[PDB]
Structures are given as structure tokens and as C-alpha cells.
Design a protein around this ligand. Structure first.
Ligand SMILES: *[C@@H]1O[C@H](CO)[C@@H](O)[C@H](O)[C@H]1NC(C)=O
Ligand SMILES: *[C@@H]1O[C@H](CO)[C@@H](O)[C@H](O)[C@H]1NC(C)=O
Ligand SMILES: *[C@@H]1O[C@H](CO)[C@@H](O)[C@H](O)[C@H]1NC(C)=O
Ligand SMILES: *[C@@H]1O[C@H](CO)[C@@H](O)[C@H](O)[C@H]1NC(C)=O
Ligand SMILES: *[C@@H]1O[C@H](CO)[C@@H](O)[C@H](O)[C@H]1NC(C)=O
Ligand SMILES: *[C@@H]1O[C@H](CO)[C@@H](O)[C@H](O)[C@H]1NC(C)=O
Ligand SMILES: *[C@@H]1O[C@H](CO)[C@@H](O)[C@H](O)[C@H]1NC(C)=O
Ligand SMILES: [Ba+2]
Ligand SMILES: [Ba+2]
Ligand SMILES: [Ba+2]
Ligand SMILES: [Ba+2]
Ligand SMILES: [Ba+2]
Ligand SMILES: [Zn+2]
Ligand SMILES: [Zn+2]
Ligand SMILES: [Zn+2]
Ligand SMILES: [Zn+2]
Lengths: 443, 444, 430, 441
């Protein structure tokens, strides 16, 4: 009895070669189990053979079906599942068997065989970091052992592994599967086997490709947002973003009890939010330097600068100190005492509700901000008559350059002494990343 | 008797879940409680972090197994009680009495109203997926109902709830009884009342307002996902959830003369049918006012002869008109120059394929009436271009002299005389008495 | 028919808990499973991280609420099945069959042996808190039993298990039936059989010996915490869990002639009585070797007359001796200079009219020797008296495992000292 | 009546609990009073036989229901006042004063010192479970505190006290504030004083000696059970409660390579780090005096470059050495022939596994410094078992602070570290990830 169930999930209803795919596997073994899975009944009809080992699995809730009907493991009775993309065909007999033999003999929980299309599967490296909401892809250093595949491959793994993931069949499978398996530390072995292409390949015209790719990028975008992947990178670069921006709200919205929503989700600050914070800091610093406002990294920004030259990865704002006596040198600041001011580049400058400090928002919609805390000497010690620690004014005589958030910012001289006076001894050396369990106990 | 309290209906921005859960914990410190949500609620729910109170997140996640989003794996007890936000346990032993009534009764669900401004009421409910409709009315055999409207604790066996396809789809008040009534199950409305929340949620008019809107949006999403286009109540009042003048038609381009919904074992959506009847009514009024001779044709005449309406799986309307009359109608005259949007938003155009005219419900909604021009050759009605149908044939002009009245789509339409013989000539003997799909070589 | 599997008996260093849990999950993927432990097991159990399988850590923690160590809070179902490591579910439906037998029967617990090397056998069990003793034997009414010895799945209602004072105290097979036998509950040893793990734990000789040694340590700590100083078996085997030659005695300094165990509504710990009997026998032996005239006195004579033993709530032994003979005994001559620790560890002291022999330097259970002298034909000390004819002659009287010497006509002698009817009217503590 | 007096800190052999109970009853005969003990106190306390005075025995017993050992079972008021032995109620209207203060302020605990020789002082306290440390200090915001030192009545809500995991674990003065400070709760030390008992307990040197021996034993057992390996005062006066030269290391055999402490969502116990630092310093001392070229390697060099210490979740130290130098060191030459215990108890052995050397802290405590011999071939440092690196990184070695002393590091160690670990590794620590560990294994 067959030990592998072919499963087809990646195809387009308007233009596919799924009937040829199914027919090709049935022509090596008429009893071969084949499952085609879809969110709704594909139209135009697929007209697959009406035989018991071929089944359409409709992954949608329906008023007249049991819970089992929308669960893909219901449709698989074999030990192994072979995910087969549309556009493949089985011509050499026994390829699924060789893949089973390779899986059992190897040490990778997945094995794959490229399909000989215009885009055969390439072996990739992938690091998934849920805390940084990032998926980092790269060339696979230990090919043919990989974390992920790009392109067309028959992928074979045990049904109990596949159907135990949270989103076994979320689309595109080429993205969702390896996000889940790579996070788990599993590997995929690119075998030296090749499945043939369909004789009449799907999506043969430019217009059909255009529709297919438009829908698939839309599925991918929605998939990465639902799964909490805000940034995709290739070799550290070619950033592809899925978070907040100048024209949207910031990811975590309004903060309740100075504990942003992302900490309860056991993650750190989204990288789109950190990116806007860096850009807003660079911009405010550039403006203050050109206007003649003396400023220095303050608080957690200074602490992040001194520790690793960037925003601390679970922080969500930037704090700078300024000489109160110099506020008038800056137009945006001058206007900020009157009322909120939207400058020429969309940055919003406000005088705070209470507490006498200035706030610069990334944009009118995206409320990530830099806070400016004005101080004035009172006989050698900086003070704000509203309350951020009081400190001696010689720490600013003079100020020091310090790498921060991708540029050079000004800091208090001997910032190490400055940091422990405000935070306590040894602060630079002992970071404490968020503690969700502790947070769960203490609200 | 062990019962898990399961909380699904609440709002993250404004709720009384902490009070709800504490009220059951005051009665039994080890009381199992499951709060279910699609995403982690923020601001934090701050439930007691004790092992018998769990939060079930129904979203997929990269670092969780499939079971973590299946709520049955959080319920170990035989029974489960769905409790809405705004409710509280005050009297001891309420859930136990509900268990007793379920074991003693015959209904598969029992329910207790909550003493909010809107306690649950007993309702009747018929679901027809084929017609995309759910029909509510007054309960004939109260306190035994098919569905409830309003706030109630609903107790049923875990095995029964979690074998539904969408046990926790929101609103539960709508979703649950749609699934239970379809299965012939009854909910027995008990004479027990749960108390309301001391600090009820949604205390301000603004908070209430943004809740009713988010609920309506969820309810509409629910009915679209489940294929309910039309909801009716006794009193005759209707809520729609499909087509209108401003949207697309529900089903899209038809291949093989068999629309997508037939493969889904459903008939034409009632909203598409409504648009087709209103377009047929309008077009007939225009042609009559213009002096264009028209007759019901094809499947429209067939439907007319059978039951005075569109065939319930059909998706367009067909009229024959005299060719020499097209010049009488302003929209028709324009349609030969190009597509014409007229005074009521109907779109008239000469079709790609067969030198016939098409009238679309709107620019976005392409439900249409097709007008087929005919001219008499020698007492024989005919045209130059033919579509590849067994229904597209010549026929004797005497069938059009004279035309007879015939109810169709809510109005009186003109039909060929002896339309039975007419229909049998075009479709074959007995067509009126033998309904069949537009092509049974594919689907019958 | 919803049953939570509850695993408590396993060793972190060597266990088959992953197989056990997986076997029940094959029969039902949503089977509730609770694995209970005092601390987080390492190496990791690596249980499935699915909502119906949970690890309950029972010790206190700075960062957890009270509820987190209370096991009932992890069990929502009506029934619980305690499953020992080494067992696996093969046939489906075994727990529901056990539930049915439970509802059908009259035993508050039912049990099914596991086909290990040591499948559960039935036992009788009698618990006497007053005497700090648990007594096991062969069970007359098997398959209905007070306790079990060996591997079994035990099923009971969760309200029954978790109202016990120490439901999951280890070892479970000792602690559970101690608590249920004391309440009059019975266990029915059903005829069902759970299979053994396909890869059993403790496969090597070193592993098994390491497990037996830590188990004996847990068993000993359990019996000490619950007040079982002695486990006795039908056939004579005795297991001691109290004081001995190298420890302190169990109760320490008595105030107001009422030892601590009386206020706990218990009698003398049996290990303390055993030490007293052995000191009495040793002292009598030394006295008889040195030719010292001794007789039973006070409560020891009373207990000898009543039942040939120490009164079970007494805590010392009193002997009278002829003062003229004190010199014939080395230990007692030495006792006048100072404390004497002899060959065998006994501590002889004079303190005070009288001498006192302690079982050992650490264990101060003692025999008091009170010397008398004949002056009037009456026996008298110098800091109550009785006529000398009660000692001429002395009679043999069983006491504490040996033949002691007692005044002649000692019943008459006991009612001179204590009043009439004393032998038949024991002054029971209340 | 809204406050239940709860007495937990006393000694059976010598106490003033009868005077205490009486004093509260003299001011209100109906006062709820609970004396809590693990076992029946002997000699008998002889407390009044009235319904509002109860003796709670918290140990499990064969004849008692579960509830009997749960302290909330004995309390039916909203508040609990923890009262130490030695205190006495004289001024009426004192507990109601503490309730009024509690309600009107923000602290969930309020306290009043008792006028003994050791009246309560206000302290700061941070608890770090990851570092297994309790850091005490003088309270910056007195009389708002994190913890108390000395005798005080402590009043808080019953629901708060009996929700803690170990609400009456002894000593209370230690156990309570470890739990409340971890939760971020404060205690407010009021300007109210409870009088002392007229006949104070433990008045003799001998009675005090016994009580202090017992209390210290209870506290050491309490700290081990709760995972506090290290107590400090103002960062000094260190008190240790973990492993040492004469014991096992805290976590024993690593099977991951994921030590047990990561599964407990903590870092390396600080006693283990202390042993590792001292072994690294001793080994380095031996290598320098014997003339062995060594350098910090792997995560030791990485930790030195990041913050000059062992990475706080790492559990060993790695050093490279020149293989041609091994002969210069007696311990190493002995290690090739068999395991050698040297004059100070360190164990030098040659793991035949990976062809390196390993120095253990002691025969029992297997925290170790690993020594990786390299040899050059064409100016590339290499070895025969396992990355290799160019020798110029060792020509010359540079000083680098590490673990309390100055150690040798490759020159350009940032470039050295980046080649081995990747760019940015110094700036982006791989912080322990409980959630992920729970997923991968
Ligand atoms: C993934 O992580 C490893 C180890 O942290 C690192 O060496 C590698 O360069 C990373 N790969 C990518 C593509 O980010
Ligand atoms: C008990 O403590 C936990 C913190 O782990 C908290 O979640 C819960 O709300 C507390 N309950 C009460 C009644 O304070
Ligand atoms: C529901 O269907 C039943 C069965 O024919 C019918 O008697 C009843 O009138 C229907 N009720 C509603 C509200 O449509
Ligand atoms: C399902 O996934 C979880 C990981 O989150 C794992 O613990 C469990 O063992 C998996 N079950 C199977 C059958 O692989
Ligand atoms: C327990 O009690 C009965 C009498 O009530 C006694 O006959 C039986 O022997 C005792 N059990 C054992 C094991 O001795
Ligand atoms: C003890 O038994 C009673 C009655 O069955 C029940 O109310 C209570 O929950 C039980 N205690 C537990 C299960 O801890
Ligand atoms: C506790 O932490 C705070 C800030 O984290 C620090 O300022 C205070 O100095 C610390 N106190 C002690 C005694 O470590
Ligand atoms: Ba900050
Ligand atoms: Ba038609
Ligand atoms: Ba038509
Ligand atoms: Ba006596
Ligand atoms: Ba390392
Ligand atoms: Zn963002
Ligand atoms: Zn429609
Ligand atoms: Zn004893
Ligand atoms: Zn240690």
C-alpha cells in the first residue's frame, strides 16, 4: 500500500495544470492518494477523477460540515506527505519512493526535489527571529542541506510533522512552511532528483503570470503580517517591510502602563518602529545642530549608545536633553510652544501636555517620537523645575561624540559616570531584556 | 458534574471579563475557565494567572503547534458553558442546575438568559444553504427554540460544540444557532437567570457605539463566509449581505453555462435574483414606453410558464425584440455607438459575440438582460448570427401574433401565444414539466 | 467519562514518561495529561507542548501564585487515573472501563495492575496513629484491598483524591493507601491489565539500584513526616523509621510529667518503647551479673502485671534495688564519681536519690534505679515505703521481652502503691 | 473586626506568644488570632479555648483534610497582621490605625516596628531570578521600602498574602519581602510603634544562641528552595547559598548542550560563575608562570570584549594555547598521562574526546576551564580535531580585562571575534530565549 499522499496547495483557480498533475501521478499507481486543498471550491471545475483516492479538501468553515472537514490531516492516511506545486508532473516511476528512502536514511526532517520549471528550487539559509519580527534569508552555506527553498520543489516530510505545525498549508506554502520549520531548527535536504514540468505549463502568458504574482504577493503580505514578520532581508540587505511607516499608525498604538503591547507578546520593538525612531532621531539631531541647539543623548538613548551604539532593542522612544536657553534658536521649537507644528518634512513638534518637554513625532499619523528635555544651570547643576535626575553641569562641559542609531550624536563627557549616576552602578554591562513571565506576574 | 466556562464574546477595548471570571472563581476557586480570542487582547486582560484559567488564542503562530489554536484541547470537562461578557455568577450552583436540566431534557443545548438590558429570547430558525437564506421567527414551542436573540449562558456537551465546523465564530449568538438549527438541534430556554455586571462594559454611549459597529462588521463577515446572503424575520423585515447596485455580482464569469454556485450545490443567490428581476422590470418598462415589441425568450419564458419567475438557478434574463424596432428606443440607438449609462444607472450595450443587446444592472454589477433582435423573413422569425445553443433557433412569426400577458418576476410580461408549444419547439417535449440544469453533461 | 491521566512516580534521571504520555495521546489526541513534579525534571521530559498536556511543579516559587502548586487546579475532569512510569496505553477504552467498574462497584478506588516485573498485589492495611504504626498483611477479601504493593493504574474521583491531606506525596503507593485506609476506603483490584513500556526505564543494574536508594530515602522521609515510626508485616518483618542508638529520642525534655506525644493525642513512639525495653534488659543483665537485688517498681511493675510490657504511653522504666548491693556493680560505683559510659554505650549517672541509665549518649531514654534499705522490717529511702516481706521472696514476671523480678503478691503490692483496681482500670490519656 | 493577628515567627522552647495573644484579647476579647506552626508546639502554648483564637498546624497529616494545612482556611477577615513573637498590644486602636494608613496610601503592605532591641529598619531590595541574587541596600525613598530588617507588625490584605506561593515560609522576615519585592509591591513603615512583651522571649545568651542557629538553618533552606544563590548588601558583604569547592556544581551534567538553568528560565548560578572566574584566574596564573602562550577564545573572548566578564548564561571558560608550550607546564604534562589533582585541588585532565585539556575547579565541582592547543603551519593556527585563523592575530597578544583580572587576547580581537562568530556579534548578544527553547528543545 502507498506510503505517500500527494498534496497540492499552490495553484491558481483561473489558470492551473492541476488535472495534468493528478493524472500524471495516477498513471504510475492508479491507487496513489492525491489531495488537492483549497479555501473555496476551485472554479472553473477541476474535474479530477471521481475515485476514492482523489479528494478535494476545502479548508473553509461551512454550516453543514463537521470540524474534521476543514482539517487537512483528515484527508491523509499515509505516513508521508509530498507537497507538490502546480506545474510539476510525475514521469519517472518511483520518485516518491526514493524520496522516502532518502528521508529515513538522512537526518533532515524534510527532503525536496526541484521541479524542472523556469524557476527550480534553490537551497537557502533562513534565520527567523520572532523577538525582532525578522526573517533573514541568505545563501545556504551547507548546501544541499538548507533551512528554506526558493522556487519549485516537491517537498516530502512526515504527515505528523506537517500537520502539527500551526499553519501547515498557509499560502504561499513556499514561504509559510520554511518559516515554521526553520524556526523549529529543522532542515530540508535538497535531493539530486528532478520532477518533470507539466507538458502544458500553467500561467504561460505574461498577463496570467501578472495576475498570479499579484495575488501571491498579496497572500504573502497578509501572511507575514498575521505571523508577525515585519522585515524580510536577503544577505542583510534588500529590505522588504511589512510594518508601520510615515503614512500609517505605529505598530503598537497607544501605550498603557508604560508596557507596550509587544512585550506581552514576548517580543521586542518592531523593526519598522525602530527604523522610524532612528530616522526621527537623525532628523531632529540634524535640525538641532544646524539651528544651534546644544543637545546630548539622555537616559535610555545614551545607555543604548554607550552599550552598542543603537536604540535598546526593546525601547520605543528616544530621549535627548537640551539647553533651555537655546530653544529660541529653533523655529520648530519656537512654534511648538504656541501649538502643534507640522514641519516641511511631515515631522510634528509639540510642547508636552504637562511636564514641560518637547516631543517630535515621526508624522501626523505615526506617533513614534523623540523627547527633548530642557535643562538650565542653577549654580553648576542642571535642573528642570518640572519632573529625570538632577546632575552637575560639568558633564556637558564639553560634550563628546558617540555613535548612535547610524550617525554620530553628542553625549555628556564621561558618559559612563553619567549613566550610573542616573541608573545605578554597572548599568552599561548588565542589560536586562524584558521578562514576560515577570511581566505576567506583575501586570 | 464538571463544567468549563468559555468566554468568547467581549471587546478588548472595553469589557467586564475580569469581573466575570472572578465571579465564578469566588464560587469555586478551581473552576476551569477558558477565555478565547483571535489575538492577544491589549490592554492586557490581566486574568488571574492560575492554572485553571487559560487564554486560548485562535490565531496561527510560527512557534505554536496546531493544537494551541484548537479550543477543544483547552476543555477537558464533559460540559462547556458559553458565557457572554456583561454576565456574572451570583447565585451558587447555577451551572450544576443547567447540567441537571440538560441530562433530564431532550434538547442538546440549554440556556439561561442574563439580566442585562437585552436578555435572550426564544426564536425559530430555518436555514437553507441552497437559497443562501436564514429565516427567523417567533418560537412556536417555547421555551424550546431553534435559536436565541440576546444574552444567555448556553451549556452543551464539549463533544457537540467542538464537532461544529466553526464553534466559536463571532458573533457566537448568530454563528452558533445557525449551525445547531441546521442540524435539527434545539436549545431549551430555562427559567434561570444569571446576573449582570456591577460595572457593566460599554458604559458610555461612544463605547457602545463603536462596539455595535464592530459587531455589525463581524456579523456581516460571518454571513458572507458562511454563505447567508439574506436574513428574514417574522414581520417580513429583511437584511441583505450580497449584491447591490454599487458592488460586483456575486459569482463572476460563467464557463460551460454552469455558474460556480451550482458546483457548490447552491442555487442563484437571492440578491442576484433580486437585481435580475428589477432589471427585467425596468427594461420592459423602457421598451414598452419606447414602442419596442418584446417577448419573454429562452429560460425566462420557461421560468414564466413554470412558476411566473426566474428559474431559481438561472443567472440572466432573455427577451426577444423585433429588429425593426430598435430605432424606437433611445438607449438602444446609443448602444450601437457604444456603451450607454442611462438615467437610472443601467448600462446598455451591443454585445461582443452575437449582434444582440445587453442591459447591465449597473456599471459594477453585471447582472443583465439580453435582448435578441429578430426580423420576419417570410412569416419566419430569424437573425443573422447564432449562438451555439439548442435554444437558439428560428420560429414561426405567428407565435408573435398576438402576444399574450404572462406574470414574470413580479410584473406582467408579454409572451408568445401558445408558449407551451413555443417552449417545446425550442427545448423539446415536456420541457415545462422536467426542470434540469443549463447543461447536465457537466452537472445535473 | 472524562479522565485525566496523572503521572507522579518517575525518576528524572531515567524514565519512560515520554512514551507513557505518547501512548495515551495515540488513543485520544486531546487526552488530558498532567505530569506532576517537585522541581523541573532535567534532562528535559520534552513533553508535547499542547494545551491538554501540562507539567505541574509542586514546590513553592518566588514568581508563582499559591494556585500553581495545588494540583486540583490542573485537573478539571471528574475522574483521575494515577499512572506509574513504566506503563503504556495499548488497547483503547481502558480508562472508561475502569470508570464503569468504579461506578458499578462499592470501592472508592479501582486499580488495574501494570504488566511490569512487579504488578500490583492486594494487601491488608491497618493504620494506628496513636501507636505511630502501620500494619500490612495478606488481604482476606481480595480482590477488595486496603492497599497495593507494586505497579498499578489507580482511578478515583478527583474530589476524593484532592481532599486528601497529601494526595501526591511520594512514594504514592505508600502515601495514598495510608490516607485512604485510614478513612475506611477500599481499592478494588480489577482484572484489567495495562501493558508495560516498550522501552522500560531502569534497564541497567546501576540505574535500578540508584532508583531504589532514592525511593527508600523518599519513603523514609514520608513516614517520618506523617508519624509512622514502624511498618510491620504479617509474618514478623519490621521496618523502623524512628530513633535509635545514634540519634536523639523522639520527644525530648518532658515538662510537667506530660511528654509531647500525649498532646498530639498519640502514645509513646514504638521506637522509643523498643529502646526502653532494650535498656531494661541490658540493665537487668548487668545487675544480675553483679549480684544486685532488683525488683520492678512503679509503672513498670504495673505494666508487667497488666500485660507483661511497658505501659504503652509511659516513657521510662523504674526498678528498685537494695542499697546495700550498689557496691557490687562497677558502673554504679563509677556513677557516684561521675557519668559512666560503658562498653556498650549506656550512660550511668547519679544526679537526686537514684541512679539513671540512658540508652546512649545521644538517646536519653532511661531506666531509673531507686535504692532502698531495710531498717524496720520496712523498705525505705531517705529523700513511699512498703514492708520488706514483699521482697522475700521475689517472683518471676514477664516484662518487655524477658523474665524480670517482681515483689511477691505484686497485685497486693500494686494496690498499696496506686489504689484499688489499678491493674484492671488503666488511666488512659485523653 | 477586620484584622486577624497571625503569629508565625516564634520558638516552641522559649516564646512570649501567650502574652502576645492575651494583649490583643485584653483590648478586644473578640479579636481573631491565629498562631501558625508546622507541628504542635511543645511545651503547650495554653492559649484561650475560644472560637476566635485558633492554632493552625500547617503540616500535612494522615487524619486531616487538605484544608487544614492551608492558612487562608483560618482567616476570615479582609486584612492580616503578621506579628512577631516579642510584641505586645498596649495602646488601643493600633490595628485600625494600620488599616486606615493602608487604604489611604499606595503601598500594599504597611508596617509598624515593635520596640524591641532590633526594631524594624527600612530596606531596598531587588530580586533577580535569572541571576539567583537578592540585592539589599539602604532604602532611597524611606519610609517607603522594599523590605524590612527587624521586628515589625506587617499588615496587608488576606487576599494578597495567601495568594503568594509561600506566604508563611520561615523566616517570614526574609520570605515575605522576597516575594512582595519581586512583585513590585512596597511596604510603608509607619510612625507607629508596638510595645515589647513585658517578659521578652530568648532573654538568655543560650536561648538566643539556639534560636539564631535554628533561624539561620531555616533561612539557608529557604533560600536554596527558592533559588536565591547569593545575597548582597550594597553590592558587598556577600552571603552564598550555592556550590563551592567541596560540592557538586549546581546543574550537574549538561545534555543539551543546554544546562538545566536555561529550562528554568534563568542564567548561570552566580556561585558557578564565581568558581569559573576563580578557576580561570588560577589557570591563567599557572600558564603565565610556566611560560605558556595563552589567549582568550570563543565566548570567553566574546564576553571579555563585550563587558569584560564571562557571559552570564555561559557555563565554562575557553582558552587557546600554543601546543609546543604544553611541555612547559607540569600539570599539563601530567594531564597527558592521566588525571592530576594539583596542590590546590584543581583537576587537570586531557579529554581524549576532542584532543584538548580541561581544568576542573575541584574533584567534586566540575566547573572547568578548557585549553585548546593550536600549532602553526604556514602562518595559520590549526589543530587536528574539531575554525582555524591566521597567526598574526597572536603577534602580538594584547591585554584585555576579563572576570576580575587582566587576560591575554588576540590583537584586533573585534576582527577576530567577527571572523569566528560573524559581524556585529559583540553588539548583538544571543540572549536566552525560553519561548524558543520550549519550541526547539
Ligand atoms: C543565521 O545565523 C547564524 C548564526 O547566528 C549566522 O552565522 C548566519 O550568518 C545567519 N544567516 C543569515 C542569512 O542571516
Ligand atoms: C494572584 O497572583 C497572580 C500573579 O501570579 C495574579 O495573576 C492573580 O490575579 C492574583 N490573585 C489575586 C486574587 O490577587
Ligand atoms: C420553518 O420551516 C418549517 C418547516 O416547514 C415551517 O413550518 C415554518 O413555517 C418555518 N418557519 C420560518 C420562520 O420560516
Ligand atoms: C507538536 O508540536 C510541539 C511543538 O510546539 C511538540 O512539542 C510536539 O511533540 C509535536 N507533536 C508531534 C506528534 O510531533
Ligand atoms: C486491622 O484491623 C483488624 C480489626 O479491626 C485486624 O483484625 C486486622 O488484622 C488489622 N490488619 C492487619 C494487617 O493486622
Ligand atoms: C472536596 O470535595 C468537595 C465535595 O465533593 C468539593 O466541593 C471540593 O471541590 C473537593 N476539593 C478538591 C477537589 O480539592
Ligand atoms: C535596585 O535596582 C535599582 C534600579 O534598577 C537600582 O537603582 C538600585 O540601586 C538597586 N539596588 C540595589 C540594592 O541593588
Ligand atoms: Ba525610557
Ligand atoms: Ba438561460
Ligand atoms: Ba442566456
Ligand atoms: Ba512512671
Ligand atoms: Ba561555549
Ligand atoms: Zn512599526
Ligand atoms: Zn448577488
Ligand atoms: Zn523513638
Ligand atoms: Zn553553583
Amino acid at each position: 500500500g502507498p506510503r505517500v499522499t500527494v498534496l497540492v496547495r499552490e495553484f491558481e483557480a483561473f489558470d492551473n495544470a492541476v488535472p495534468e498533475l493528478v493524472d500524471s501521478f495516477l498513471q504510475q499507481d492508479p491507487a496513489q492518494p492525491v489531495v488537492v486543498a483549497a479555501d473555496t471550491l476551485p472554479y472553473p471545475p477541476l474535474a479530477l477523477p471521481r475515485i476514492p483516492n482523489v479528494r478535494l479538501a476545502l479548508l473553509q468553515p461551512a454550516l453543514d460540515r463537521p470540524a474534521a472537514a476543514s482539517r487537512p490531516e483528515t484527508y491523509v492516511a499515509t505516513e508521508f506527505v509530498a507537497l507538490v506545486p502546480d506545474g510539476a508532473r510525475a514521469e519517472a516511476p518511483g520518485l516518491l519512493e526514493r524520496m522516502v528512502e532518502a528521508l529515513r536514511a538522512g537526518s533532515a526532517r524534510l527532503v525536496a526535489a526541484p521541479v524542472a520549471t523556469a524557476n527550480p528550487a534553490r537551497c537557502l539559509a533562513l534565520n527567523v527571529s520572532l523577538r525582532e519580527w525578522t526573517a533573514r534569508y541568505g545563501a545556504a552555506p551547507a548546501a544541499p542541506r538548507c533551512d528554506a527553498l526558493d522556487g519549485d520543489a516537491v517537498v516530502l516530510l512526515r504527515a505528523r510533522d506537517l500537520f502539527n505545525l500551526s499553519a501547515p498549508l498557509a499560502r504561499p506554502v513556499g514561504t509559510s512552511l520554511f518559516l515554521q520549520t526553520a524556526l523549529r531548527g529543522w532542515a530540508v535536504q535538497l535531493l539530486d532528483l528532478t520532477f518533470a514540468a507539466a507538458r502544458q505549463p500553467p500561467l504561460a502568458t505574461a498577463h496570467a503570470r501578472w495576475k498570479a504574482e499579484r495575488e501571491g504577493r498579496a497572500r504573502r503580505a497578509a501572511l507575514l503580517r498575521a505571523l508577525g514578520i515585519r522585515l524580510v532581508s536577503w544577505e542583510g540587505g534588500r529590505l522588504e517591510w511589512f510594518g508601520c511607516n510615515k503614512e500609517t499608525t505605529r505598530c503598537f498604538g497607544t501605550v498603557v502602563g508604560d508596557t507596550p503591547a509587544y512585550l506581552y507578546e514576548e517580543r521586542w520593538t518592531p523593526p519598522c518602529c525602530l527604523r522610524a525612531l532612528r530616522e526621527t532621531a537623525r532628523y531632529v539631531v540634524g535640525v538641532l545642530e544646524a539651528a544651534g541647539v546644544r543637545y546630548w543623548l539622555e537616559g535610555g538613548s545614551l545607555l543604548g549608545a554607550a552599550r552598542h551604539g543603537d536604540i535598546i532593542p526593546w525601547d520605543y522612544d528616544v530621549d535627548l536633553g537640551i539647553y533651555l536657553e537655546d530653544v529660541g534658536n529653533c523655529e520648530q521649537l519656537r512654534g511648538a510652544e504656541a501649538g502643534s507644528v507640522v514641519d516641511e518634512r511631515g515631522f510634528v513638534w509639540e510642547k508636552a501636555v504637562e511636564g514641560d518637554f518637547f516631543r517630535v513625532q515621526y508624522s501626523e499619523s505615526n506617533h513614534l517620537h523623540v523627547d527633548l528635555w530642557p535643562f538650565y544651570p542653577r549654580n553648576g547643576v542642571m535642573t528642570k523645575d518640572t519632573w529625570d535626575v538632577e546632575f552637575p553641569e560639568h558633564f556637558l562641559q564639553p560634550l563628546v561624540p558617540l555613535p548612535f542609531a547610524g550617525f554620530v550624536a553628542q553625549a555628556p563627557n564621561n558618559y559612563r559616570r553619567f549613566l550610573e549616576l542616573k541608573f545605578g552602578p554597572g548599568v552599561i554591562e548588565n542589560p536586562q531584556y524584558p521578562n514576560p513571565a515577570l511581566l505576567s506576574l506583575t501586570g
